[PDB]
Design a protein around this ligand. Structure first.
Ligand SMILES: N#Cc1cc(=O)[nH]c(=O)n1[C@@H]1O[C@H](COP(=O)(O)O)[C@@H](O)[C@H]1O
Ligand SMILES: N#Cc1cc(=O)[nH]c(=O)n1[C@@H]1O[C@H](COP(=O)(O)O)[C@@H](O)[C@H]1O
Lengths: 257, 257
């Protein structure tokens, strides 16, 4: 039997970051993660402020921000705390353990100092998670494993996807769920976040493929939709985010019965 | 038939970046790529200057440099031209095409502006290469595809590796070879670069595995060794680099006949 997000937030084995996320999703009636793929700090902060009430999470690509500074991230955290959403840096860590630990803690971005969540590819084997958790666990962070991808020709299928699920289950002190196109784990403590989402059918011309909120939340069992251009390219971004939120939320309600 | 680097530099289908590399390898008698895994720009530059004559390539992780600026990269380019080596940013692009094109061109690092070579994971499908190609093709850059990894539990095996090779063959205007543990293509226009190399046996505590230069270049047919800690942890990094250069070069001379 399917548990509500609010019930899942209280599960004995729930990770604290997942619990915080699930509580705010239930409170705000949102399972929408905004992909804020912008090149200017001022745009990132403007979108975070305007759309924060509608989202459970803001997904960043800090390596595309032309004017990144750590002060920009302090301010983004202020917005996150005010509007109540988590920050997910879509770094897709994919190196050996010794390297990802430095990529996560250090350099100019100091990602672990501000991202509630990050993600990682499972291709290197479990050392990728072991390296990240050395940094993440003291800093009370979580990680999502990339179990499937939305893009055409993705090799994250079959036994690869199964390997991701097993890695997550063996590292549940740090891994809180998955980037996937559908539910891949039956354990309710794991979150499923699904990119490649738009209301209408289609793709882009660099291999992105889209499915609808109803398909991915309702039929495929995922928890959260990740939406970028579907919102950002709209004339009215506030209305667009509300359309996506209401779509994802009602799809969740229906599955829950 | 085993061809010399200098001969391969003249192959009909050879990418200009690959030709430049193969020519300097021949001239300098080096098939060593230094993995300059350091956090200070002053150390990176001092290594690049001192070790420049011994190496064919310097591999960077710019996202671990605490004091990155584009001025540091300007000075690295100057040393690369002075000493004749290529700059390889080990970014391991691994996102959909629309994203990676921005990650390569933009942000604070502006990687395309200074890196001769970058690498990509093939797990997203060929959109990853298409996205990078939009930026790198006119700049005469090249890309390496990650066909195998050195770390324990690596999923880059079997049909995954075969997919990487197919993708390289289908995008040979931009893809110039592979990160792999052994020869994966018999096409001599492709470079093979192999990480997880130390003179001594072992690994690290986070999944890295090591094989010797003789094994990797001599028995497994790779072209270039990528060496980090085997050199960087030495008291005298120049002496260490010379030892690795001689090991790798003599192993290559041996399979030539
Ligand atoms: N997360 C993620 C990731 C993996 C995946 O499999 N598919 C994606 O589209 N993404 C990311 O989600 C966003 C998709 O945005 P859009 O909705 O296609 O504009 C991008 O930031 C992309 O890099
Ligand atoms: N290239 C690469 C990459 C992929 C791989 O499969 N194995 C690696 O060790 N690496 C990188 O090579 C270097 C290995 O360094 P070391 O020789 O283990 O100190 C690191 O910068 C690591 O991130």
């Amino acid at each position: 039997m399917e548990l509500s997000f609010g019930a899942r937030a209280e599960l004995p084995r729930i990770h604290p970051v997942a619990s915080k996320l699930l509580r705010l999703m239930q409170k705000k009636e949102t399972n929408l993660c905004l992909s804020a793929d912008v090149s200017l700090a001022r745009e990132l902060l403007q979108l975070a402020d305007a759309l924060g009430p509608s989202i459970c999470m803001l997904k960043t690509h800090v390596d595309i921000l032309n004017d990144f500074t750590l002060d920009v991230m302090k301010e983004l955290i202020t917005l996150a705390k005010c509007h109540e959403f988590l920050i997910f840096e879509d770094r897709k860590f994919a190196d050996i353990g010794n390297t990802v630990k430095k990529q996560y803690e250090g350099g100019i971005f100091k990602i672990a100092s501000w991202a509630d969540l990050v993600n990682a590819h499972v291709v290197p084997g479990s050392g990728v998670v072991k390296g990240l958790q050395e940094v993440g666990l003291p800093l009370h962070r979580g990680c999502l494993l990339i179990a499937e991808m939305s893009s055409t020709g993705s090799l994250a299928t079959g036994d690869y996807t199964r390997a991701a699920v097993r890695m997550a289950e063996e590292h549940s002190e740090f891994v809180v769920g998955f980037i996937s196109g559908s539910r891949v784990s039956m354990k309710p403590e794991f979150l499923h976040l699904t990119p490649g989402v738009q209301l209408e059918a289609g793709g882009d011309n660099l291999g992105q493929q889209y499915n609808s909120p109803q398909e991915v939340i309702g039929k495929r069992g995922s928890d959260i939709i990740i939406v970028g251009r579907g919102i950002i390219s709209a004339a009215d971004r506030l209305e667009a985010a509300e359309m996506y939120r209401k779509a994802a939320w009602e799809a969740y309600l229906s599955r829950l019965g």
